[PDB]
Symmetry: D2
Subunit: 194 residues, 4 copies
């Protein structure tokens, strides 16, 4: 007795389009920046749209009506892209270059690089909106972007496996050990400049 | 003497324009399919004009050879070709794209309304989009050729012949296939319309 | 009370790998053939793995045990690739170039081009096996290949929509009208040779 | 005088070799992940040696300049770089690939067992595969560099410096990062192994 999967299938479709739109902006920046300064800020990107089960789960946790309309108006990380950068300073270069764009707007920002989480997690999280041009309408949609270095990706990926303690203490060691190395690398890369 | 190759810049920013249009096109195809359960775009092809082709074009229109002047005189530096499943898709794509805020129409030539002498049929529009570079916004024209499969079939073959080009023997016979393809693709369209009701 | 989705998810995984393997052989042929004769036989390819529902449905129709093992040993078109060619004669060039390969074996062949189906359908269907090299074993798997021209693809795609009559008679007209045009095209293309 | 560019042939068939190996690698990654719920390959990178690099290499080994002789003397014409998530993945990939019937091992140099003077670490193997061309079968060597992310991080940076190359100031300090990366990536591996039980 319902049609509830109609907006969710709809949901996934329009939010992937937002990822396609943002991915493009990112690639052109990386391309052009490299074309100007002989250096790629972006090592690579990853895109994912939240599974429906995670959406419904998340809606239930905050006690909200279970519909695509309500997920659409309450969940900002439905569409997610992860930008992995070669160097720390690249992270903030991308953030700047993306936000200054006309159709791109900043909604939420959390910088766990300056202020890592308790367990050691480091990463710049921003939510932006872009317009998505559909066959018969324009949707302005939020995309969640995680900007991190290779090192931050490495550590995050492992700590994440553990969620599915004894390792808490030892992970924090790696988190700073990685910070330490990537700054050596950053320092050396900088001295050569372009 | 000293590197006059500003074109590498040209090639760089105009290929970026193609990514932006291509992204737009792909989303229209995707969303229209999600709504009317049918993909208008069969596929797309993208190309940035060879520098060899540019200078030749500049030479022909009697223009100075610099990237700067090509940027403001050649609209088909960046080109994309949208091959559609059915005749009516050609005009759906045209409509869906123009209605987008950041797409601006510059030029339009409809060789479907008025096929060329040799039989060529195709819808040509030039649009502008903004390209967001690391340090500036460049607004660039992309030339878009919209056609059906048959029109594509025919075009690519005619291109091989003319582009020692004899034609001659085939001009007459190519024009026959051009019309024969039109006729059938209308049969196909007629049928497709009736069942999508 | 079962694990029946384990082999099916397994099934889809190993059969896509077969598609990756066959796709590659095809691309190298198209690439190299064009590199030698300045002409691409392949306009494009399409790959698809049968949905589980279609597999189960098909198993039920022939009254077979419902398991991935049994689908694996009875259904040859689990993995399918559709090679669309620019010209009719290209179809048989590809067939030859693919079958002569050491790791490629012909299992089933149906040529609806010489002998179209009653409704007008034209297409060369072959089933081949390739070995698929997995982490811990080698599977030899069947892939079903449909080789057709652009014209044949066009007609097929439309006739297919109709399955989901008045149009039967009129489709057959298009089927031969398309044959007629593509042969004109074939004739003209041939006269220029390479 | 007359087109000596047999290399375009060379570039053509060796890029075909990369497609065949790349396909193999991708399937191993996919299947291993399906079984042990973990991707060994983080990503891959492919490259066919620039002709500029080839002739230079031929010049250095004092060989005649022809595609024919390069074909039988240069094993790294086609090269692929497999970046892995964990140290142990490097050897899993090595093993899974060699056990394939049509992959034949030609050469092996393990700079992880024995890192170079400057700190470089990486597992180098040359394999042969058959390439099925339109009219023949060519058996070609591909050079494969297998490394962890950290080894990749470090390598790409060291490459920028040496490839006016000062090094000097950084050699010492690069070697420090090389060891610092090793140490941590073993911490990571140690932890990952314990939880995958
Ligand atoms: N590896 C790792 N990632 C962290 C950690 N803390 C945050 N993150 C990242 O932050 C992303 C969003 O998680 P949070 O915002 O912190 O919590 P949420 O459930 O999303 O509710 P909230 O957005 O805050 O309102 C995660 O998305 P994910 O899809 O990646 O995971 P996952 O899906 O498990 O989150 C992670 O990428 C951490 O301690 N370790
Ligand atoms: N096959 C074919 N195409 C035609 C014909 N008339 C126009 N076109 C297409 O229109 C595009 C440009 O032709 P025109 O606009 O009429 O002339 P211009 O663009 O000003 O100079 P230009 O053609 O680019 O050198 C071409 O793009 P291209 O990238 O394809 O090449 P190509 O352009 O070389 O033909 C053709 O594909 C025709 O009679 N046959
Ligand atoms: N458009 C069209 N295709 C036909 C027609 N006859 C055969 N085909 C193609 O042949 C493919 C396999 O269908 P068949 O072999 O004829 O019948 P099967 O159900 O597969 O059992 P069988 O293989 O013979 O033992 C189809 O796969 P599909 O995935 O494409 O469809 P679809 O999934 O509906 O088949 C079609 O691609 C036809 O009259 N029109
Ligand atoms: N960054 C770095 N790489 C090393 C080092 N030693 C070996 N390599 C890698 O090994 C590859 C070839 O180096 P060698 O095998 O030792 O020497 P040869 O292959 O015989 O000549 P060649 O290097 O190709 O000119 C390179 O491939 P490439 O494609 O990367 O370039 P590149 O090869 O230019 O270094 C390097 O990536 C090192 O000290 N630092
Ligand atoms: Fe855009
Ligand atoms: Fe193979």
């Amino acid at each position: 007795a319902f049609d509830t999967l109609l907006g969710f299938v709809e949901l996934d479709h329009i939010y992937s389009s937002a990822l396609k739109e943002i991915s493009t902006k990112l690639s052109i920046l990386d391309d052009n920046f490299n074309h100007i300064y002989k250096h790629n800020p972006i090592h690579h990107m990853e895109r994912r749209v939240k599974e429906m089960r995670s959406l419904i789960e998340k809606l239930n946790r905050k006690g909200l009506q279970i519909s695509a309309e309500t997920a659409k108006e309450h969940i900002l990380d439905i569409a997610g892209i992860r930008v992995v950068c070669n160097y720390l300073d690249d992270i903030y270069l991308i953030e700047e270059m993306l936000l200054k764009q006309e159709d791109v707007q900043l909604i939420k920002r959390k910088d766990y690089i300056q202020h890592p989480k308790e367990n050691g997690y480091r990463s710049l999280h921003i939510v932006v909106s872009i317009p998505v041009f559909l066959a018969e309408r324009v949707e302005v949609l939020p995309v969640e972007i995680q900007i991190r270095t290779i090192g931050m990706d490495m550590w995050a990926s492992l700590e994440h496996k553990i969620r599915y303690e004894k390792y808490r203490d030892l992970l924090k060691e790696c988190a700073t050990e990685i910070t330490e190395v990537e700054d050596k690398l950053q320092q050396i890369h900088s001295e050569i400049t372009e």
